[PDB]
Amino acid sequence: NLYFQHMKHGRVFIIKSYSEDDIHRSIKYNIWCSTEHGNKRLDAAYRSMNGKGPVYLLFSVNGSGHFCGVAEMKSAVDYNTCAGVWSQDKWKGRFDVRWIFVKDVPNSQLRHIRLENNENKPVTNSRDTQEVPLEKAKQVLKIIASYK
Ligand SMILES: Oc1cnnc(S)n1
């Protein structure tokens, strides 16, 4: 398949969400927020990249048994922003994103991909902002990119 070849330099992260409504707001406005340490993690991966490659985000609603799409981080993290705009006031902050695929891909299509940096646990077992090794990430993205 013809998706995501020549990723070159890159870093990929798992996004776990407790609110579909947050996902929809994120699609509607190309913005996201994570935890305090989630924000610090993605912030570093974004600032250290210096435009030289894409920071991609893989999205899954918790308990949903699927992934729900793919997006690219498009800015650093802003820590002083309007409170209370997400489902919980515990999401303080904002960075921009750009959604690339909005589609549901069942975990049955992805669970045989494992993260050697997560004690060999499957990709579908990740917590929020679990980083993915570039070579397994490429597998995930291509699986989602082309799922029918
Ligand atoms: O459940 C979550 C997780 N991360 N961000 C937001 S806005 N909601």
PDB file of N, CA and C in Angstrom, residues 28-80:
ATOM      1  N   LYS A  28     -13.845  18.696  15.271  1.00  0.00           N
ATOM      2  CA  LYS A  28     -14.530  19.911  14.839  1.00  0.00           C
ATOM      3  C   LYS A  28     -13.583  21.106  14.775  1.00  0.00           C
ATOM      4  N   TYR A  29     -12.519  21.115  15.591  1.00  0.00           N
ATOM      5  CA  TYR A  29     -11.702  22.316  15.739  1.00  0.00           C
ATOM      6  C   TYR A  29     -10.195  22.082  15.654  1.00  0.00           C
ATOM      7  N   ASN A  30      -9.740  20.854  15.403  1.00  0.00           N
ATOM      8  CA  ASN A  30      -8.313  20.589  15.212  1.00  0.00           C
ATOM      9  C   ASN A  30      -7.493  21.046  16.428  1.00  0.00           C
ATOM     10  N   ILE A  31      -7.955  20.668  17.624  1.00  0.00           N
ATOM     11  CA  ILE A  31      -7.277  20.988  18.877  1.00  0.00           C
ATOM     12  C   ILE A  31      -7.321  19.767  19.784  1.00  0.00           C
ATOM     13  N   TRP A  32      -6.331  19.654  20.658  1.00  0.00           N
ATOM     14  CA  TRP A  32      -6.367  18.586  21.643  1.00  0.00           C
ATOM     15  C   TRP A  32      -5.696  19.052  22.930  1.00  0.00           C
ATOM     16  N   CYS A  33      -5.979  18.309  23.998  1.00  0.00           N
ATOM     17  CA  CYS A  33      -5.370  18.503  25.294  1.00  0.00           C
ATOM     18  C   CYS A  33      -5.215  17.123  25.896  1.00  0.00           C
ATOM     19  N   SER A  34      -4.140  16.912  26.669  1.00  0.00           N
ATOM     20  CA  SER A  34      -3.954  15.681  27.434  1.00  0.00           C
ATOM     21  C   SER A  34      -3.795  15.981  28.922  1.00  0.00           C
ATOM     22  N   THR A  35      -3.142  15.087  29.665  1.00  0.00           N
ATOM     23  CA  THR A  35      -2.860  15.320  31.076  1.00  0.00           C
ATOM     24  C   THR A  35      -1.744  16.352  31.233  1.00  0.00           C
ATOM     25  N   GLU A  36      -1.390  16.645  32.490  1.00  0.00           N
ATOM     26  CA  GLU A  36      -0.211  17.466  32.749  1.00  0.00           C
ATOM     27  C   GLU A  36       1.039  16.795  32.201  1.00  0.00           C
ATOM     28  N   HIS A  37       1.259  15.525  32.559  1.00  0.00           N
ATOM     29  CA  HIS A  37       2.453  14.854  32.059  1.00  0.00           C
ATOM     30  C   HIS A  37       2.279  14.402  30.614  1.00  0.00           C
ATOM     31  N   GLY A  38       1.045  14.118  30.186  1.00  0.00           N
ATOM     32  CA  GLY A  38       0.796  13.909  28.771  1.00  0.00           C
ATOM     33  C   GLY A  38       1.198  15.111  27.940  1.00  0.00           C
ATOM     34  N   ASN A  39       0.833  16.307  28.400  1.00  0.00           N
ATOM     35  CA  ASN A  39       1.199  17.514  27.672  1.00  0.00           C
ATOM     36  C   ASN A  39       2.709  17.706  27.646  1.00  0.00           C
ATOM     37  N   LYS A  40       3.375  17.519  28.791  1.00  0.00           N
ATOM     38  CA  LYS A  40       4.829  17.646  28.827  1.00  0.00           C
ATOM     39  C   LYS A  40       5.507  16.624  27.905  1.00  0.00           C
ATOM     40  N   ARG A  41       4.965  15.408  27.817  1.00  0.00           N
ATOM     41  CA  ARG A  41       5.571  14.397  26.944  1.00  0.00           C
ATOM     42  C   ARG A  41       5.470  14.788  25.464  1.00  0.00           C
ATOM     43  N   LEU A  42       4.246  15.030  24.970  1.00  0.00           N
ATOM     44  CA  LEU A  42       4.046  15.433  23.579  1.00  0.00           C
ATOM     45  C   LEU A  42       4.725  16.756  23.256  1.00  0.00           C
ATOM     46  N   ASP A  43       4.759  17.685  24.209  1.00  0.00           N
ATOM     47  CA  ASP A  43       5.440  18.960  23.999  1.00  0.00           C
ATOM     48  C   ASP A  43       6.914  18.755  23.648  1.00  0.00           C
ATOM     49  N   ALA A  44       7.609  17.934  24.447  1.00  0.00           N
ATOM     50  CA  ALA A  44       9.020  17.651  24.213  1.00  0.00           C
ATOM     51  C   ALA A  44       9.226  16.994  22.860  1.00  0.00           C
ATOM     52  N   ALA A  45       8.418  15.974  22.556  1.00  0.00           N
ATOM     53  CA  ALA A  45       8.541  15.312  21.265  1.00  0.00           C
ATOM     54  C   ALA A  45       8.301  16.282  20.117  1.00  0.00           C
ATOM     55  N   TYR A  46       7.478  17.304  20.339  1.00  0.00           N
ATOM     56  CA  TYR A  46       7.206  18.262  19.280  1.00  0.00           C
ATOM     57  C   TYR A  46       8.331  19.284  19.147  1.00  0.00           C
ATOM     58  N   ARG A  47       8.797  19.829  20.272  1.00  0.00           N
ATOM     59  CA  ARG A  47       9.823  20.864  20.217  1.00  0.00           C
ATOM     60  C   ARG A  47      11.167  20.287  19.779  1.00  0.00           C
ATOM     61  N   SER A  48      11.491  19.064  20.217  1.00  0.00           N
ATOM     62  CA  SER A  48      12.739  18.420  19.816  1.00  0.00           C
ATOM     63  C   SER A  48      12.748  18.015  18.345  1.00  0.00           C
ATOM     64  N   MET A  49      11.583  17.982  17.697  1.00  0.00           N
ATOM     65  CA  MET A  49      11.517  17.540  16.315  1.00  0.00           C
ATOM     66  C   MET A  49      11.883  18.663  15.358  1.00  0.00           C
ATOM     67  N   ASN A  50      11.589  19.915  15.738  1.00  0.00           N
ATOM     68  CA  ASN A  50      11.948  21.105  14.956  1.00  0.00           C
ATOM     69  C   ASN A  50      11.560  20.948  13.484  1.00  0.00           C
ATOM     70  N   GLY A  51      10.276  20.687  13.248  1.00  0.00           N
ATOM     71  CA  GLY A  51       9.741  20.611  11.907  1.00  0.00           C
ATOM     72  C   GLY A  51      10.331  19.540  11.026  1.00  0.00           C
ATOM     73  N   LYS A  52      11.347  18.813  11.492  1.00  0.00           N
ATOM     74  CA  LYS A  52      12.058  17.854  10.660  1.00  0.00           C
ATOM     75  C   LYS A  52      11.272  16.568  10.410  1.00  0.00           C
ATOM     76  N   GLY A  53      10.095  16.403  11.013  1.00  0.00           N
ATOM     77  CA  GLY A  53       9.310  15.194  10.875  1.00  0.00           C
ATOM     78  C   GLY A  53       7.968  15.318  11.575  1.00  0.00           C
ATOM     79  N   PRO A  54       7.050  14.389  11.303  1.00  0.00           N
ATOM     80  CA  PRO A  54       5.703  14.475  11.893  1.00  0.00           C
ATOM     81  C   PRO A  54       5.560  13.746  13.224  1.00  0.00           C
ATOM     82  N   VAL A  55       4.905  14.411  14.174  1.00  0.00           N
ATOM     83  CA  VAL A  55       4.495  13.802  15.441  1.00  0.00           C
ATOM     84  C   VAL A  55       3.039  13.381  15.250  1.00  0.00           C
ATOM     85  N   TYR A  56       2.795  12.079  15.086  1.00  0.00           N
ATOM     86  CA  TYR A  56       1.455  11.563  14.827  1.00  0.00           C
ATOM     87  C   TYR A  56       0.806  11.031  16.110  1.00  0.00           C
ATOM     88  N   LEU A  57      -0.520  11.118  16.160  1.00  0.00           N
ATOM     89  CA  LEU A  57      -1.307  10.729  17.322  1.00  0.00           C
ATOM     90  C   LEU A  57      -2.344   9.697  16.901  1.00  0.00           C
ATOM     91  N   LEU A  58      -2.386   8.568  17.609  1.00  0.00           N
ATOM     92  CA  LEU A  58      -3.308   7.475  17.313  1.00  0.00           C
ATOM     93  C   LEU A  58      -4.374   7.463  18.394  1.00  0.00           C
ATOM     94  N   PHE A  59      -5.645   7.535  17.982  1.00  0.00           N
ATOM     95  CA  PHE A  59      -6.747   7.890  18.867  1.00  0.00           C
ATOM     96  C   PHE A  59      -7.631   6.687  19.165  1.00  0.00           C
ATOM     97  N   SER A  60      -7.993   6.531  20.442  1.00  0.00           N
ATOM     98  CA  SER A  60      -8.904   5.467  20.848  1.00  0.00           C
ATOM     99  C   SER A  60      -9.712   5.904  22.072  1.00  0.00           C
ATOM    100  N   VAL A  61     -11.015   5.742  21.972  1.00  0.00           N
ATOM    101  CA  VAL A  61     -11.893   5.968  23.101  1.00  0.00           C
ATOM    102  C   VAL A  61     -11.792   4.765  24.030  1.00  0.00           C
ATOM    103  N   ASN A  62     -11.605   5.030  25.320  1.00  0.00           N
ATOM    104  CA  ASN A  62     -11.357   3.958  26.273  1.00  0.00           C
ATOM    105  C   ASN A  62     -12.590   3.064  26.408  1.00  0.00           C
ATOM    106  N   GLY A  63     -12.351   1.742  26.385  1.00  0.00           N
ATOM    107  CA  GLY A  63     -13.382   0.727  26.424  1.00  0.00           C
ATOM    108  C   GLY A  63     -14.101   0.510  25.111  1.00  0.00           C
ATOM    109  N   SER A  64     -13.743   1.247  24.058  1.00  0.00           N
ATOM    110  CA  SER A  64     -14.510   1.173  22.821  1.00  0.00           C
ATOM    111  C   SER A  64     -14.133  -0.026  21.976  1.00  0.00           C
ATOM    112  N   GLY A  65     -12.977  -0.634  22.232  1.00  0.00           N
ATOM    113  CA  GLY A  65     -12.542  -1.786  21.471  1.00  0.00           C
ATOM    114  C   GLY A  65     -12.106  -1.477  20.060  1.00  0.00           C
ATOM    115  N   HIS A  66     -11.968  -0.207  19.717  1.00  0.00           N
ATOM    116  CA  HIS A  66     -11.398   0.138  18.438  1.00  0.00           C
ATOM    117  C   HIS A  66     -10.530   1.369  18.606  1.00  0.00           C
ATOM    118  N   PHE A  67      -9.797   1.666  17.553  1.00  0.00           N
ATOM    119  CA  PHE A  67      -9.216   2.979  17.383  1.00  0.00           C
ATOM    120  C   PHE A  67     -10.189   3.794  16.562  1.00  0.00           C
ATOM    121  N   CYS A  68     -10.090   5.123  16.653  1.00  0.00           N
ATOM    122  CA  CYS A  68     -11.047   5.927  15.921  1.00  0.00           C
ATOM    123  C   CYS A  68     -10.435   6.916  14.943  1.00  0.00           C
ATOM    124  N   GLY A  69      -9.119   7.062  14.888  1.00  0.00           N
ATOM    125  CA  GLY A  69      -8.535   7.831  13.805  1.00  0.00           C
ATOM    126  C   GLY A  69      -7.097   8.222  14.093  1.00  0.00           C
ATOM    127  N   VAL A  70      -6.558   9.047  13.184  1.00  0.00           N
ATOM    128  CA  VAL A  70      -5.152   9.455  13.183  1.00  0.00           C
ATOM    129  C   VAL A  70      -5.063  10.969  12.999  1.00  0.00           C
ATOM    130  N   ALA A  71      -4.117  11.597  13.689  1.00  0.00           N
ATOM    131  CA  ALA A  71      -3.956  13.039  13.601  1.00  0.00           C
ATOM    132  C   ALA A  71      -2.495  13.396  13.815  1.00  0.00           C
ATOM    133  N   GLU A  72      -2.126  14.579  13.346  1.00  0.00           N
ATOM    134  CA  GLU A  72      -0.762  15.057  13.458  1.00  0.00           C
ATOM    135  C   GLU A  72      -0.719  16.246  14.395  1.00  0.00           C
ATOM    136  N   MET A  73       0.256  16.238  15.285  1.00  0.00           N
ATOM    137  CA  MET A  73       0.452  17.375  16.159  1.00  0.00           C
ATOM    138  C   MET A  73       0.934  18.554  15.322  1.00  0.00           C
ATOM    139  N   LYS A  74       0.324  19.727  15.522  1.00  0.00           N
ATOM    140  CA  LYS A  74       0.603  20.888  14.680  1.00  0.00           C
ATOM    141  C   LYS A  74       1.099  22.113  15.446  1.00  0.00           C
ATOM    142  N   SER A  75       1.473  21.979  16.717  1.00  0.00           N
ATOM    143  CA  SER A  75       1.977  23.116  17.486  1.00  0.00           C
ATOM    144  C   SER A  75       2.475  22.631  18.837  1.00  0.00           C
ATOM    145  N   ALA A  76       3.245  23.491  19.501  1.00  0.00           N
ATOM    146  CA  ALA A  76       3.617  23.251  20.888  1.00  0.00           C
ATOM    147  C   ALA A  76       2.378  23.328  21.777  1.00  0.00           C
ATOM    148  N   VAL A  77       2.580  23.087  23.055  1.00  0.00           N
ATOM    149  CA  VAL A  77       1.490  23.092  24.021  1.00  0.00           C
ATOM    150  C   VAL A  77       1.368  24.463  24.668  1.00  0.00           C
ATOM    151  N   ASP A  78       0.138  24.951  24.759  1.00  0.00           N
ATOM    152  CA  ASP A  78      -0.165  26.199  25.433  1.00  0.00           C
ATOM    153  C   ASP A  78      -0.781  25.854  26.780  1.00  0.00           C
ATOM    154  N   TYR A  79      -0.124  26.252  27.867  1.00  0.00           N
ATOM    155  CA  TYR A  79      -0.597  25.833  29.180  1.00  0.00           C
ATOM    156  C   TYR A  79      -1.601  26.791  29.808  1.00  0.00           C
ATOM    157  N   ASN A  80      -1.571  28.088  29.481  1.00  0.00           N
ATOM    158  CA  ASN A  80      -2.555  29.021  30.042  1.00  0.00           C
ATOM    159  C   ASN A  80      -3.596  29.273  28.965  1.00  0.00           C
TER     160      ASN A  80
END
